[PDB]
C-alpha cells in the first residue's frame, strides 16, 4: 500500500496567485446591461408562473430527443483569459444562480485556477478550454455568449516564476522565455539572438512605445552585442543603452512617456512574442460577432497602445458602442500593486443603426463632402460577380438555400 | 553501408554484455526516437532488452512505452516458451524489477496494461505475494480494475 | 572601377573600418563560441565515459 | 445614406439625422456579408461514385488498363477553391476597402 | 505466338535512334459473380447496378491499383507536353538518367508480326495512346508499352540553367557540344 | 590535432541543452579544415624574458 | 512615388548600397 | 569495502561576483545506492532554489553529477555545501564515518576563467555488520517557459466502467 | 508588411492553392499509407500549404465541406479513403437503392423513441431491443458531427441551451483515460491458437464486403490514424504571420507559430516538412545550403519542396536536389533520401544538362503545371477573363 | 562473455588474426600513404 506522489518544484511550492483587479466594477460591467434586465425579468416571470400552476411556495410578495430538457434563465459569459480565476469567480458568486462562465487560457498552468473553482461549483456552471482568445469565434460561432470579458498582459503567477521568465531583480542567470502559452514559438533569448536589426525596429514601432529614435538605439545594442547566455547579459546590455530599470519592475506607476527606454523595451518585447496587437484586435472583433444583440464586452487596458486599439475599433465597427470607461480605483493600487493607468472598457453591441449614434458627435463638414464624392464616384462598391464573391451572402438565409437544408 | 536489419542481426548475435557499447555506438537511433527503441526491444531477447534499458537509464530519459514494449516482449517470450517447449520461462523477478524501474521513473503515469502484463508474467511462476503487492500498489494510486483482479486471482 | 570612383575618402574609411570590425567580431565569435546553436550552452557539459 | 433605402438605389431625402456616410456604408457591407451559401450535397455525386459507375460499365478484361490510366494521370484537373479556402480568401478581402 | 518477356527488344532504325518493343503483360480479370456473364458483345448494358457490385469492383480497383503501384517507380516521367497529330510524341525523364523522345501509335504493330487478338479500340487503351494524348507534362507514362523512334538527347557536363543567351553563335555551338572555348 | 583529439570512443549523458548539432553548411565529403585544433602558443625563452 | 515606399522596408545593411555610410546621403 | 573514498571534481567559472559549478561526484567502489544519494540532494535543494538553476542526475553506478548555471556567490556555495553535506550524510547512513578529507583549488586556464576544485573524502568501516513512493526520472527534463502538454496529460486514469471496489480498507 | 501580405494572398492565393494540390495529389498516390501526424511548414507566410494538408489528409474535420464532385478530393491516403467511403455509402443508399425500406426503419424509430419518453411505458417488457439502443446512440453521435458542419464551428454543443453534464468539466478524464482499443503484439493473450495458426482467411470477396459495410471498426481505425495533431509554422515577417493566422485558425486548430528556424530546432522530428515557395525567398546573406540541410534532418517521413517554375528557382531546386542527394552514403540505409517525385533516376537531371537548353530557354525547366479556376483578383490585374488559370510549378518530393 | 568499457569490439562473423611481416623498404614505396601526388615502387600494405 504505497501512495505515489510527484515531487513538487520550487515554482509549485512558492506559487503566488494574481490579485483581484476590480470585483464590484466588473460585476456591473460584465453582467449588467440589456441582456441582464430581461434575464432578471424572465426569472420573475417564471417565479409567478410556478405559483400559478400549484407548486409549493412561500408566503411573500411575488433540440432533439436526448436533450429535450434545455436550461432555464441562465446567463452565459465567456472569459477569454481567466488567469487566477478571480474575475471568473466574481461572476458565478455574485450572480448567484442562472449564470455560467466558459473560461479560456493560453497556459496549462491555469488548470490549477480552473480546478479550485469546480470544487465550489462545477459541472453545470464552469467550462474550461486551453486556447487563444483569437480562436474563440472558430469554436463558438456567431451570437454565442451573452457576455464576453477580455483581460490582457501577464498574471502575477507568471511574473515571479523563474522558469516562466519575467524576473528582473533575481541576480541569477535564467532563460528569458517570456511567453504566455505553448502556442507561440521562440522566446526572447531565441528571438533577440536571431532577429535582424530591421525586423526588431519594425516590431517595436507597432506598439507605440519606444519610437524610431529610441528603437534604433536599443536595436543597435542588441544586434552588436549578442552572445546571450541568459537574461542577465541581456539586462546589462539593455540598461547600458538606456537608463536602469525602475524599482517597481514591470509595474511602474510613473508616466508612459517619462518611463525609461529599458522599461519601454521590455514591455514591448513581451508584446512582440505573444503578439498582443493581433490577439487584442482579433479578440475584440470576434467578440462582437460572438455576442448576442445588446450584449456586453469588457476589455481591460493597461498600456497606451491598447487604449488606441479599443478606441479605434468601437468607432469603425457597425455594432460596437462604448457604454462607459472606468479607471482603476486608487485603493486597489496600494494593497494589490496594479498599474495606475489600468482602465476598464465596457463595450456594448447594437441591434441596428450603430452609426446613427456615432454621427451625433463625430461628423465634420469635410466628412460630409467626402461622403458626397464617394457616392458620386462609387467607391463604396464591393464584389459580387467574381468567382469567390458569388458564393457569399449575408447572415439571413435566402430562399434558394432553405431548400438545401431540407435535404442536407 | 548497413541497414537496420543488419544492425538487428548484429544485436541478436552479440551477447548481453555487448548491449551497452553498441547502444552507445549507434545512439543516433535511440536518443530521440522512441519508436526505434520500441522496435529494437521488440525484436531481440528480453535479457538484451533489460540490458538496453539499464544502459539507457544513465544516458536518456526513457518513457512508459519503452517498459510497455519490454513487458510485451516478455509476454511474447512466455507465449513462445509455452508453444515450443524448450527454454526457460521469463522469471518473475525480472518482471517485478522492470515494473519497479518504470514505477520509480514514471510514477502514476504507467497504464494499467503495465500492471496486467506484470500479473501475466507473474502468473506462471505462481508468485502470489507479488500479485497482492501489485494490487495494494494499484489500489493506493486509485486505479483498481477488474482484469487486474482476474489476473491476480490467476496468480 | 566605378564603385571606388564613386566613393569618397571618408566613405572608404568607414567601409574599411566596418569590414575590419565585422571581421574581428566574426573571428572572436568563432574562436570563443563553437557548434553554432545561436546561444552559448549555459551549462558545463556532462562527464563523458569510455564506451 | 438612410438605412431605409437600398445601397444601389439613391435616396431622394436631403436630411442629415439618422443617416450614415458612404464610407460607413461600405464598412457594414464588408462587415455583414460573411456567410457561404449552403452546398447541395445530393445534387452532385461524389467523384469516387462517378468513377466506380464507369468501372462497372467497362469490360473486366479492360479494367486493369483503366486503373493504370487513372493512376498515371497526376493532374487533378481544374483546381477549384474549397469553401474553407473561399472563406479565408474573403476574410482577407473584407478587412479593408476595395479602393 | 509471342512469348512473354520483360526485356525490351531494341531495333536500331538509324543513327541516334532505336525502337523499344515491349508488351505490357495482360492479366486475367477477377472471377467474382459480378464479372461473370458480363454482356461484352452488346456494349449497351441496362442491367441494374446493385451497391454490392460497386463495393466488389471497389476492392478490385484497390487490387489493380496495388498491382500498378509496384511497377510505378519503373515508369517514365512526361517532362515536355506531347504533340498529337495522329501519333503522340513527347519527352520523358527515364529511370536511367536519360532524356528520350518517343512516339506512340494508335494501331497495333507487334515486334514480329501485326497479327493479334485486339481491335483498334482495345490497343489504343493498352499501348497508352489514349493515355499520353490526355495527360500533360509532369505525369507518369508506362515503360511496358512499346515506344517507337526513341532518340536520346545529348548531354553536357555543366548545367545549361543560368546560362547567358547573349553569347555569340560559334561559342554557343561550342558550349552545347561539350567542348567549350 | 593531437591536443583536441579525445582518447578513444567517448560518449556522455544527453539533455535538451547540450546538442552538438550537425549544422555545418558545407559538404560532408570534404574534410579539409574541419578538424578541431588548438592555436600554437610557444612560451618565451629567458633571453626574451 | 510607389518605389520610394519600400525604402523604409529594406534591411539596414543593403539600404544605402552604392555608398558605405548613410550619414552623407540626401536627407 | 572497509574504507570509502569519494572524489569530487568541481568546474568553476567566475564573472565578477557570480559562480558556475559543475560537480561530478565519484565513489570508490560499487554497491553505494546513488539513487538514494541524489534524491536526498533533490529534496534538500528544491526548497532552497528552483530547478532552472541546477540539475542533478546519475551518470554511472559509482558516479553522479550536479551543475549550477551562473548564480551569485552567496547562492552558489549554498548549493555546494548542501551537496557535500548530503554526500557525507548518505555515506554515514551506509555505516561509515568521515575519517579525513582535503580540498584542492587549481589556478585559472591560460585564456579563460575556469577553475577546478578537487574535493576528496575518506571514510572507514564504522558499523559492524508502506511508505510514500516519490518517483522522478534519472535524467531530468527542462521546464523552459509554459508547459506544452497539460497537467493531467502526464498521469493516467482507468475507465469508470472498469473500476472496482477497494478490497483493502482506506482510511 | 501586412499591406504587402494582403496583395500577396489575394493575387497568389488560388495559384499557390492549386500548386500545392498538384503535389499532394501525387504524394497521396505514390505513398498511400502516409499520414503526417506532425507537420512543419518552413516559410509559412500564408497558410495555403497547411490548409491543403488539412484538406488532403482530413476532409472530415474541416469547418466547411469539400466539393465532393471534384477529382481533387479523391486522394489515395488511408484517412482520405476512409472519408471517401462514407461519402460513397451516402451515394449508394440514395441512388443505387430504389427500395424505401431504409425510410421505413427511420420514421418508425423516430416515432418510437419520441413516444416512449413521455407517453408509452418503459422498454423493459420488450426484450432484445439492443439493436435499437446501439443504433440510436450511434445516430446521436452522427447528430453531433451534423451540427458542427451546419455551424462551421466545433464545440457548438456547449453554446446551446442544454444543461451541462455534471462531472469532468475541465476535460481531465477524457484526455487521460486508458484506451482499450490499442493492443500491441504482447498485450494480447490467452486465446484460441487456431486463430493464430490459420493464415490467409479473409481472401474472399464476401468477407471483404462485411469488412467495409460495418462502420463501428472504421471509427476505431480513424482514432488510431490521427491525421494532424500538432502543426508548426515558421514565419519571420509579422505581416505574413498575422494573415496566415487568420487563414488557418478557422480550419486548422492548435497551430504553433514559430518566428525563426534555429540550429537548435533540428532536434524536433516531424512527419512532414513543407517548404512551399520559400526556398527562393531566402536572402543571399543567409546560407541556403545550411537551411535545406537542416530541413531534411527534421523529417520522419516526407520533405516537400514546391517552387514556381522559373530559371532562378529551378537552379535553386536542382542545387537543393544535389545537396540532399549528397547525404546518401553517410550512415544508416533506412534514413537515406529517396526521390519519390518527379525525377525517378536520382542522377543529374537530363533536362538540366541537355544540349538543346544552351541556346533555348524553354528546354531548361523539368517542371509541371496545375490548372485552376481563377478569382476576380487575377482577371482584374491581367486584364483578360481567364476562367481557367495556369500555374507552372517545379516540385520535389 | 563479459564486457569491459574499453575493449575492442570485434563484429560478428569476423575473427582477428595477428600477422608479423617484414620488408626491405628500399625496394618498396613504404606503407600506406594518405594523400598521393596529383596532376615501379608499390606500397607494402596493398
Ligand atoms: N491571448 C490570450 N488568450 C487567452 N489567454 C491569455 C492570452 N494572453 C494572456 N492570457 C492569459 O491570461 C493570464 C493573465 S490575464 C491577468 C488577470 C487574470 N486573467 C484575472 O482575471 O484575474 C495569463 O496567465 C495568460 O496565460
Ligand atoms: N530565410 C528565411 N527563413 C524563414 N522564412 C523565410 C526566409 N526567407 C523568407 N521567408 C518567408 O517565406 C515566405 C515565402 S512566401 C510563401 C508563403 C507560403 N509558404 C505559401 O506558399 O502560401 C515569405 O513570407 C518570407 O517571409
Ligand atoms: Zn527531370
Coil vs helix vs strand at D78: strand
Coil vs helix vs strand at I58: coil
Query: Residue I17's closest CA among I247, I298, I201?
Result: I247
Say if residues I293 and I327 touch (Cβ distance below 8 Å). yes
Cα end-to-end span (Å), chain E: 56
Give the three cell numbers for residue B128. 502470489
d(C-alpha I237, C-alpha D30), whole Å: 27
Determine how β-strand H3-9 pairs with β-strand E140-141: unpaired
Residues 6+ apart with CB under 8 A from I245: A134, A278, I47, I255, I257
Which atom of ligand 1 has the smallest separation from the CA of A21? 22
d(C-alpha A30, C-alpha A99), whole Å: 12
The sign of the dihedral angle between the CA atoms of I209, I210, I213, I217 is negative
DSSP code of residue A110: G
DSSP per residue, A317-340: STTEEEEEEEEPPHHHHHHT---T
Coil vs helix vs strand at I69: coil
Cβ atoms within 10 A of the Cβ of I121, count? 8
Inter-CA distances, H152 with A111, A199, I175, Å: 9, 39, 8
E153: left (phi over 0), alpha (psi -120 to 50) or beta: beta
d(C-alpha E21, C-alpha E27), whole Å: 19
Radius of gyration of chain H (CA): 20
Coil vs helix vs strand at E115: coil
Q: Supply φ then ψ for residue A326, to 5 degrees.
A: -115, 135
DSSP code of residue E11: -
Coil vs helix vs strand at C27: helix
Q: Supply φ then ψ for residue H59, to 5 degrees.
A: -110, -15
| Residue D31 burial by Cβ neighbours in a 10 Å radius (0-12, 13-18, 19+) | middle
Give the three cell numbers for residue A112. 490549477
d(C-alpha D98, C-alpha A377), whole Å: 13
Which residues are E20's β-sheet partners? E10, E147
Total residues found in chain E within this entry: 181
Query: Residue A390's closest CA among I116, D46, D90, I174?
Result: D90
Query: Residue A223's closest CA among A241, A208, A207?
Result: A241
Say if residues H49 and H75 touch (Cβ distance below 8 Å). yes
d(C-alpha A289, C-alpha A143), whole Å: 6
DSSP code of residue E3: P
d(C-alpha D87, C-alpha E4), whole Å: 55
d(C-alpha C34, C-alpha I260), whole Å: 20
DSSP code of residue I163: P
Which residues of chain C neighbour B20 with C-beta distances below 8 Å?
51
Which residues are E85's β-sheet partners? E87
SS (H, E, C) chain H: CCEEEEEEECCEECCCCEECCEEEEECCCCCCCHHHHHHHHHHHHHHHCCCCCCCEEECCCCEEEEECCCEEHHHHHHHHHHHHHHHHHHHHHCCEEEEEEEEEECCCCCCCCEECEEEEEEEEECCCCCCCEECCCCCCCCCCCCCCCCHHHCCCECCCCCECCCCCCCC
Helix D83-93 with I238-248: angle, nearest 10 deg: 140
Residues 6+ apart with CB under 8 A from A234: A176, A188, A189, A192, A228
**How many Cα neighbours within 13 Å face the side chain of I95?**
17
Q: Is A133 annotated as a binding residue?
A: yes
DSSP code of residue A299: E
d(C-alpha E99, C-alpha E77), whole Å: 10
d(C-alpha A106, C-alpha A273), whole Å: 13
Ligand 1, pocket-test mutation among A84, A106, A140, most atoms within 8 A of CB: A106
Coil vs helix vs strand at J14: coil
DSSP H helices, D1-99, are: 22-32, 47-57, 63-72, 83-93
A302: left (phi over 0), alpha (psi -120 to 50) or beta: alpha
Which atom of ligand 2 has the smallest separation from the CA of I45? 17
Give the three cell numbers for residue D88. 479565408
Cβ atoms within 10 A of the Cβ of A277, count? 19
Give, using CA atoms, the residue closest to atom 14 of ligand 2. Answer: I278
G19 lies within 8 A of chain C by CB: yes
Determine how β-strand D78-79 pairs with β-strand E9-10: unpaired
Which residues of chain F neighbour B18 with C-beta distances below 8 Å?
none
Chain CA centroid to CA A320, Å: 16
Asked whether the beta carbons of residue A3 and residue H132 sit closer than 8 angstroms, the reply is yes
**How many Cα neighbours within 13 Å face the side chain of C29?**
16
d(C-alpha D48, C-alpha D44), whole Å: 12
Inter-CA distances, I89 with H57, I214, I215, Å: 57, 11, 11
DSSP per residue, A354-380: HHHHHHHHS--HHHHHHHHHHHHHTTT
**Ligand 3 centre and the CA of B65: distance in Å?**
43
d(C-alpha C34, C-alpha F38), whole Å: 13
Residues 6+ apart with CB under 8 A from H17: H72, H73
Cβ atoms within 10 A of the Cβ of D18, count? 13
Give the three cell numbers for residue B30. 535511440
Q: Supply φ then ψ for residue A347, to 5 degrees.
A: -105, 135
Determine how β-strand H96-105 pairs with β-strand H64-67: unpaired
Inter-CA distances, B2 with B26, B33, I300, I329, Å: 11, 19, 19, 10
Give the three cell numbers for residue I38. 506532425
Say if residues A292 and I159 touch (Cβ distance below 8 Å). no
Give the three cell numbers for residue D43. 445534387
Query: Residue I344's closest CA among H21, A363, G12, E138?
Result: E138
Say if residues B114 and I181 touch (Cβ distance below 8 Å). no
**Ligand 2 centre and the CA of I20: distance in Å?**
15
Which residues of chain A neighbour D18 with C-beta distances below 8 Å?
353, 356
Residue I240 CB less than 6 A away from ligand 2: yes
Inter-CA distances, A262 with A81, A187, A243, A274, I267, Å: 28, 18, 6, 19, 34
Determine how β-strand H96-105 pairs with β-strand H56-58: unpaired
Coil vs helix vs strand at I227: coil
Q: Supply φ then ψ for residue A373, to 5 degrees.
A: -75, -40
Residues 6+ apart with CB under 8 A from E63: E30
User: From the CA of I241, which ligand is nearest?
Assistant: 2
Give the three cell numbers for residue H143. 521546464
Give the three cell numbers for residue D50. 462517378
Q: After which residues is chain I broken (C to N over 2.5 A)?
A: none
User: From the CA of I238, which ligand is nearest?
Assistant: 2
Determine how β-strand E9-10 pairs with β-strand A4-5: unpaired
Which residues are H118's β-sheet partners? H9, H104
Give the three cell numbers for residue C42. 549555459
DSSP code of residue I168: -
CA triple E15-E16-E18, angle to 5 deg: 90
Radius of gyration of chain D (CA): 25
Residues 6+ apart with CB under 8 A from D20: A355, A356, A359, D1, D3, D28
The sign of the dihedral angle between the CA atoms of A351, A352, A357, A358 is positive
Cα end-to-end span (Å), chain B: 49
Ligand 1, pocket-test mutation among A130, A180, A283, most atoms within 8 A of CB: A180
| Residue I217 burial by Cβ neighbours in a 10 Å radius (0-12, 13-18, 19+) | exposed
Edge-first strand listing for the sheet containing H56-58: H56-58, H64-67, H22-26, H3-9, H117-125, H96-105
Helix I238-248 with I48-57: angle, nearest 10 deg: 20
d(C-alpha H41, C-alpha H32), whole Å: 15
DSSP per residue, chain B: -B-HHHHHHHHHHS-STTHHHHHHHSTTTTSS-HHHHHHHHHTS-HHHHHHHHHHHTTTS---HHHHHHHHHHHHHHHHHHHHS--SPPPPHHHHHHHHHHHHHHSSS-S-HHHHHHHHHHHTTTT-HHHHHHHHHHHHHTT--BHHHHHHHHH-
Asked whether the beta carbons of residue I238 and residue A203 sit closer than 8 angstroms, the reply is yes
Say if residues B36 and B66 touch (Cβ distance below 8 Å). no
G14 lies within 8 A of chain C by CB: no
d(C-alpha I132, C-alpha I113), whole Å: 9
Q: Supply φ then ψ for residue H143, to 5 degrees.
A: -105, 85
d(C-alpha B68, C-alpha B102), whole Å: 9
Residues 6+ apart with CB under 8 A from A373: A379
Say if residues I244 and I232 touch (Cβ distance below 8 Å). no
Determine how β-strand I230-234 pairs with β-strand I255-258: parallel
Coil vs helix vs strand at I66: coil
d(C-alpha A212, C-alpha A230), whole Å: 27
DSSP per residue, E124-152: HHHSSHHHHHH--TTSEE-SSS-EEEEEE
Amino acid at each position: 500500500m504505497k501512495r505515489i506522489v510527484v515531487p513538487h518544484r520550487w515554482s509549485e511550492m512558492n506559487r503566488v496567485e494574481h490579485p483581484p483587479l476590480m470585483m464590484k466594477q466588473l460585476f456591473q460591467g460584465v453582467c449588467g446591461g440589456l441582456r441582464w434586465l430581461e434575464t432578471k425579468s424572465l426569472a420573475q416571470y417564471l417565479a409567478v408562473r410556478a405559483i400559478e400552476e400549484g407548486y409549493p411556495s412561500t408566503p411573500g410578495v411575488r433540440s432533439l430527443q436526448v436533450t429535450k430538457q434545455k436550461r432555464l434563465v441562465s446567463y452565459d459569459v465567456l472569459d477569454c483569459t481567466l488567469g487566477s480565476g478571480y474575475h471568473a469567480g466574481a461572476v458565478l458568486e455574485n450572480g448567484g444562480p442562472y449564470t455560467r462562465v466558459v473560461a479560456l487560457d493560453c497556459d496549462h498552468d491555469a488548470m490549477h485556477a480552473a480546478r479550485d473553482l469546480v470544487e465550489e461549483f462545477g459541472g453545470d456552471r464552469f467550462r474550461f478550454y486551453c486556447c487563444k482568445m483569437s480562436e474563440a469565434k472558430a469554436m463558438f460561432g456567431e451570437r454565442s455568449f451573452d457576455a464576453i470579458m477580455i483581460d490582457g498582459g501577464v498574471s502575477d503567477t507568471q511574473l515571479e516564476d523563474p522558469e516562466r521568465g519575467f524576473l528582473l531583480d533575481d541576480e541569477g542567470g535564467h532563460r528569458l522565455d517570456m511567453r504566455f502559452g505553448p502556442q507561440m514559438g521562440v522566446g526572447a533569448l531565441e528571438y533577440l539572438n536571431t532577429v535582424s536589426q530591421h525586423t526588431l525596429v519594425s516590431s517595436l514601432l507597432a506598439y507605440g512605445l519606444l519610437e524610431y529614435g529610441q528603437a534604433m538605439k536599443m536595436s543597435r545594442a542588441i544586434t552588436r552585442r549578442k552572445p546571450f547566455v541568459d537574461s542577465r547579459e541581456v539586462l546589462t546590455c539593455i540598461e547600458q543603452a538606456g537608463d536602469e530599470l525602475p524599482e517597481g519592475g514591470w509595474r511602474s506607476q510613473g508616466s508612459r512617456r517619462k518611463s525609461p527606454m529599458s522599461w519601454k523595451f521590455l514591455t514591448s518585447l513581451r508584446c512582440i512574442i505573444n503578439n498582443e496587437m493581433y490577439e487584442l484586435r482579433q479578440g475584440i472583433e470576434n467578440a462582437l460577432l460572438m455576442l448576442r444583440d445588446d450584449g456586453r464586452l469588457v476589455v481591460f487596458s493597461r498600456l497606451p497602445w491598447e487604449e488606441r486599439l479599443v478606441r479605434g475599433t468601437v468607432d469603425d465597427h457597425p455594432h460596437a458602442l462604448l457604454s462607459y470607461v472606468e479607471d482603476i480605483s486608487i485603493d486597489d493600487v496600494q494593497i494589490y500593486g496594479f498599474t495606475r493607468h489600468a482602465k476598464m472598457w465596457v463595450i456594448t453591441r447594437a441591434a441596428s443603426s450603430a452609426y446613427a449614434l456615432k454621427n451625433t458627435t463625430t461628423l465634420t463638414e469635410e466628412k460630409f463632402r467626402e461622403s458626397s464624392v464617394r457616392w458620386l464616384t462609387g467607391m463604396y462598391a464591393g464584389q459580387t460577380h467574381g468567382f469567390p464573391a458569388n458564393n457569399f451572402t449575408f447572415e439571413n438565409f435566402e430562399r434558394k438555400e432553405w431548400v438545401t437544408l431540407r435535404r442536407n | 553501408g548497413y541497414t537496420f536489419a543488419d544492425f538487428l542481426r548484429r544485436l541478436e548475435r552479440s551477447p548481453d554484455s555487448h548491449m551497452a557499447p553498441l547502444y552507445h555506438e549507434h545512439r543516433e537511433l535511440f536518443v530521440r526516437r522512441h519508436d526505434m527503441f520500441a522496435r529494437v526491444i521488440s525484436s531481440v531477447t528480453w535479457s538484451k532488452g533489460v540490458a538496453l534499458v539499464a544502459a539507457a537509464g544513465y544516458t536518456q530519459a526513457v518513457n512508459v512505452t519503452i517498459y510497455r514494449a519490454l513487458l510485451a516482449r516478455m509476454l511474447l517470450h512466455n507465449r513462445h516458451v509455452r508453444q515450443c517447449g524448450a527454454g526457460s520461462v521469463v522469471p518473475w523477478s525480472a518482471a517485478l524489477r522492470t515494473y519497479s524501474e518504470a514505477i520509480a521513473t514514471h510514477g502514476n503515469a504507467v497504464p494499467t496494461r503495465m500492471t496486467l502484463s506484470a500479473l501475466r508474467l507473474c502468473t506462471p511462476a505462481r508468485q502470489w505475494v507479488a500479485a497482492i503487492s501489485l494490487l495494494m500498489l494499484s489500489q493506493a494510486n486509485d486505479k483498481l480494475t477488474l482484469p487486474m483482479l482476474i489476473d491476480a486471482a490467476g496468480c | 572601377w566605378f564603385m571606388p570612383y564613386l566613393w569618397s575618402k571618408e566613405e572608404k574609411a568607414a567601409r574599411q573600418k566596418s569590414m575590419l570590425a565585422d571581421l574581428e567580431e566574426v573571428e572572436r565569435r568563432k574562436n570563443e563560441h563553437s557548434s553554432g546553436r545561436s546561444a552559448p550552452p549555459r551549462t558545463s557539459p556532462p562527464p563523458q565515459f569510455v564506451r | 445614406h438612410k438605412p431605409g433605402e437600398s445601397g444601389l438605389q439613391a435616396g431622394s431625402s436631403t436630411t442629415i439625422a439618422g443617416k450614415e456616410t458612404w464610407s460607413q456604408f461600405s464598412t457594414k457591407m464588408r462587415y455583414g456579408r460573411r456567410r457561404i451559401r449552403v452546398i447541395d450535397v445530393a445534387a452532385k455525386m461524389s467523384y469516387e461514385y462517378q468513377m466506380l459507375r464507369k468501372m462497372c460499365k467497362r469490360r473486366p478484361a479492360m479494367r486493369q488498363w483503366a486503373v493504370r490510366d487513372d493512376f498515371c494521370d497526376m493532374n487533378p484537373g481544374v483546381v477549384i477553391m474549397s469553401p474553407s479556402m473561399q472563406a479565408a480568401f474573403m476574410k482577407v478581402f473584407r478587412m479593408k476597402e476595395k479602393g | 505466338g509471342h512469348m512473354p518477356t520483360d526485356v525490351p527488344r531494341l531495333v536500331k532504325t538509324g543513327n541516334t535512334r532505336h525502337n523499344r518493343l515491349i508488351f505490357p503483360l495482360q492479366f486475367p480479370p477477377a472471377t467474382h459473380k459480378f464479372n461473370r456473364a458480363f454482356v461484352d458483345a452488346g456494349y449497351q448494358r441496362q442491367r441494374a447496378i446493385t451497391p454490392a457490385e460497386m463495393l466488389v469492383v471497389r476492392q478490385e480497383v484497390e487490387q489493380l491499383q496495388q498491382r500498378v503501384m509496384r511497377a510505378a517507380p519503373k515508369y517514365l516521367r512526361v517532362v515536355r507536353d506531347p504533340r498529337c497529330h495522329g501519333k503522340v510524341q513527347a519527352d520523358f525523364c527515364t529511370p536511367e538518367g536519360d532524356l528520350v523522345s518517343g512516339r506512340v501509335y494508335r494501331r497495333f504493330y507487334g515486334d514480329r508480326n501485326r497479327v493479334s487478338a485486339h481491335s483498334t479500340m482495345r490497343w489504343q487503351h493498352i499501348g497508352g495512346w489514349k493515355l499520353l494524348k490526355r495527360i500533360r507534362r509532369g505525369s507518369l507514362f508506362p515503360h511496358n508499352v512499346p515506344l517507337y523512334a526513341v532518340t536520346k538527347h545529348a548531354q553536357i557536363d555543366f548545367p545549361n540553367t543560368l546560362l547567358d543567351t547573349k553569347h555569340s553563335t560559334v561559342e554557343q555551338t561550342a558550349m552545347q557540344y561539350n567542348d567549350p572555348m | 590535432r593531437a591536443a583536441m583529439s579525445p582518447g578513444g570512443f567517448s560518449t556522455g549523458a544527453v539533455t535538451e541543452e547540450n546538442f552538438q548539432p550537425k549544422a555545418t553548411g558545407e559538404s560532408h565529403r570534404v574534410t579539409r579544415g574541419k578538424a578541431p585544433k588548438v592555436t600554437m602558443e610557444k612560451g618565451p625563452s629567458n633571453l626574451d624574458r | 512615388r510607389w518605389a520610394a515606399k519600400f525604402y523604409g522596408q529594406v534591411t539596414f545593411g543593403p539600404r544605402n548600397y552604392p555608398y558605405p555610410s548613410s550619414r552623407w546621403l540626401a536627407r | 569495502p572497509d574504507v570509502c573514498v569519494v572524489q569530487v571534481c568541481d568546474h568553476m567559472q567566475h564573472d565578477q561576483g557570480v559562480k558556475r559549478h559543475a560537480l561530478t561526484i565519484t565513489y570508490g567502489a560499487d554497491g553505494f545506492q546513488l539513487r538514494s544519494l541524489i534524491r536526498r540532494v533533490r529534496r534538500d535543494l528544491e526548497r532552497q532554489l528552483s530547478s532552472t538553476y541546477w540539475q542533478c542526475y546519475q551518470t554511472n553506478e559509482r558516479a553522479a553529477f550536479f551543475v549550477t548555471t551562473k548564480v551569485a556567490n552567496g547562492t552558489a556555495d549554498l548549493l555546494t555545501t548542501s551537496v557535500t553535506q548530503q554526500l557525507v550524510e548518505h555515506t554515514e547512513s551506509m555505516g561509515y564515518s568521515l575519517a579525513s578529507s582535503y580540498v584542492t583549488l587549481s589556478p585559472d586556464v591560460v585564456h579563460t576563467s575556469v577553475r577546478m576544485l578537487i574535493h576528496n573524502f575518506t571514510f572507514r568501516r564504522s558499523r559492524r555488520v508502506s511508505e510514500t513512493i516519490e518517483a522522478e526520472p534519472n535524467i531530468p527534463t527542462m521546464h523552459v517557459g509554459p508547459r506544452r502538454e497539460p497537467l493531467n496529460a502526464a498521469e493516467s486514469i482507468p475507465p469508470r466502467n472498469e473500476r472496482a471496489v477497494n478490497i483493502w480498507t482506506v482510511d | 508588411s501586412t499591406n504587402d501580405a494582403i496583395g500577396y494572398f489575394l493575387f497568389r492565393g488560388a495559384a499557390m492553392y492549386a500548386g500545392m494540390h498538384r503535389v499532394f495529389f501525387e504524394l497521396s498516390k505514390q505513398l498511400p499509407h502516409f499520414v503526417p501526424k506532425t507537420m512543419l511548414d518552413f516559410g509559412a507566410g500564408t497558410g495555403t500549404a497547411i490548409l491543403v494538408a488539412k484538406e488532403v489528409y482530413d476532409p472530415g474535420s474541416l469547418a466547411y465541406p469539400l466539393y465532393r464532385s471534384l477529382r481533387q478530393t479523391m486522394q489515395g491516403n488511408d484517412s482520405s479513403r476512409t472519408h471517401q467511403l462514407s461519402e460513397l455509402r451516402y451515394d449508394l443508399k440514395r441512388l443505387q437503392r430504389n427500395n424505401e425500406e431504409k425510410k421505413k426503419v427511420r420514421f418508425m424509430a423516430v416515432a418510437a423513441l419520441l413516444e416512449r419518453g413521455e407517453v408509452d411505458p418503459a422498454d423493459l417488457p420488450e426484450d432484445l431491443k439492443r439493436e435499437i439502443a446501439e443504433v440510436a446512440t450511434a445516430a446521436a453521435t452522427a447528430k453531433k458531427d451534423r451540427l458542427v458542419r451546419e455551424a462551421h464551428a466545433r464545440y457548438r454543443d456547449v453554446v446551446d441551451g442544454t444543461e451541462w453534464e455534471s462531472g469532468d468539466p475541465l476535460g481531465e478524464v477524457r484526455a487521460s483515460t486508458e484506451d482499450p482499443e490499442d493492443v500491441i503484439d504482447g498485450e494480447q493473450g490467452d486465446g484460441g491458437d487456431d486463430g493464430e495458426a490459420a493464415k490467409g482467411r479473409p481472401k474472399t470477396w464476401w468477407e471483404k464486403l462485411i469488412d467495409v459495410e460495418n462502420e463501428t471498426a472504421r471509427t476505431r481505425a480513424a482514432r488510431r490514424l490521427r491525421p494532424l495533431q500538432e502543426v508548426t509554422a515558421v514565419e519571420p515577417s509579422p505581416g505574413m504571420m498575422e494573415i496566415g493566422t487568420m487563414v488557418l485558425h478557422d480550419d486548422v486548430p492548435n497551430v504553433t507559430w514559430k518566428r525563426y528556424l534555429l540550429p537548435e530546432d533540428e532536434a524536433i522530428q516531424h512527419d512532414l516538412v513543407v517548404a512551399a515557395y520559400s526556398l527562393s525567398e531566402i536572402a543571399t546573406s543567409e546560407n541556403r545550403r545550411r537551411i535545406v540541410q537542416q530541413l531534411w534532418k527534421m523529417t520522419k517521413g516526407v520533405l516537400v519542396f514546391v517552387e514556381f517554375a522559373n530559371l532562378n528557382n529551378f537552379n535553386i531546386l536542382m542545387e537543393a536536389r544535389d545537396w540532399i542527394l549528397e547525404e546518401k552514403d553517410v550512415g544508416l540505409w533506412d534514413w537515406q533520401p529517396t526521390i519519390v517525385a518527379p525525377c525517378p533516376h536520382e542522377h543529374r537531371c537530363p533536362l538540366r544538362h541537355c544540349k538543346t537548353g544552351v541556346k533555348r530557354k524553354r528546354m531548361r525547366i523539368c517542371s509541371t503545371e496545375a490548372h485552376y479556376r481563377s478569382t476576380f483578383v487575377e482577371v482584374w490585374a491581367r486584364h483578360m477573363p481567364l476562367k481557367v488559370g495556369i500555374e507552372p510549378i517545379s516540385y520535389l518530393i | 562473455e563479459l564486457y569491459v568499457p574499453g575493449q575492442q569490439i570485434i563484429p560478428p562473423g569476423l575473427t582477428r588474426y595477428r600477422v608479423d611481416v617484414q620488408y626491405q623498404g628500399n625496394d618498396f614505396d613504404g606503407w600506406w600513404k594518405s594523400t598521393t601526388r596529383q596532376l615501379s615502387r608499390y606500397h607494402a600494405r596493398t
